[PDB]
Amino acid sequence: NGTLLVPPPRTIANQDHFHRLNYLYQISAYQTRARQKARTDAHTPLARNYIKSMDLISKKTKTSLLPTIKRTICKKCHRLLWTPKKLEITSDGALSVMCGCGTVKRFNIGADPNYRTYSEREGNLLNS
């Protein structure tokens, strides 16, 4: 089919950008969890901001993320869904996950099982 070339020289600028993205995601998640465990929604427009800036960096470097991150974050307001509104299933569709802002992220789960994403398949992925 073609040529099989596997390079492990990772580039320094891509490592800098992904460390920046991962640091923003970690600080937003830790703000959200440290606020959520203790008391009510104090600075929930704050951490979301980081995620939004994170996604804007994903516009600049043109990089892609795993569907775990994009499944965690929202699409319109770009907030973390670690505490969502409601989860409904088999309500004449497949699945529905409601949020506080009203934007839902649903999944076709009632069609068939054993469907995996392209990054979750057996051999398509090499860690580190």
């Binding site: 640091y23 703000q31 440290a34 427009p45």
Partner: protein, 134 residues
């Protein structure tokens, strides 16, 4: 009510940083009404007598370990700062700092055109274009 605030994250952030300043001014007024200079007694005074006013107050004692340890460990990982310091490379480190974000940094105003801005340390909650928020 809650849906109309978080329609735009920027405007909700502006409303939050305005509400923190208004709550700080109300805290100064209730602190002069308290006539107690101790802040640890002041926080318990607000918890006893003003429940709704206490809800939007920041917690700096919580803010220091949740930010400083992550920031220092991220810089120790990113700039390759290890126990071996004699293999350092300064130009690529300054290029990485030009590529790294300052969201969550402890930073100090050491020199300024205004004589009152100097001496201020603070941790970033958001980076603006031409101002700075600590």
């Amino acid at each position: 009510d809650y849906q109309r605030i978080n329609k735009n994250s920027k405007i909700a952030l502006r409303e939050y940083i305005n509400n923190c300043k208004k709550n700080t001014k109300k805290c100064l007024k209730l602190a002069y009404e308290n006539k107690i200079t101790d802040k640890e007694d002041l926080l318990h005074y607000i918890e006893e007598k003003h429940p709704t006013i206490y809800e939007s107050l920041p917690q700096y004692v919580d803010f220091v370990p949740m930010y400083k340890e992550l920031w220092i460990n991220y810089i120790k990982e990113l700039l390759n700062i290890t126990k071996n310091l004699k293999t350092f490379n300064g130009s690529l480190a300054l290029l990485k700092l030009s590529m790294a974000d300052y969201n969550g940094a402890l930073l100090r105003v050491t020199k300024s055109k205004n004589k009152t801005l100097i001496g201020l340390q603070g941790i970033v909650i958001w980076d603006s274009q031409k101002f700075f928020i600590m």
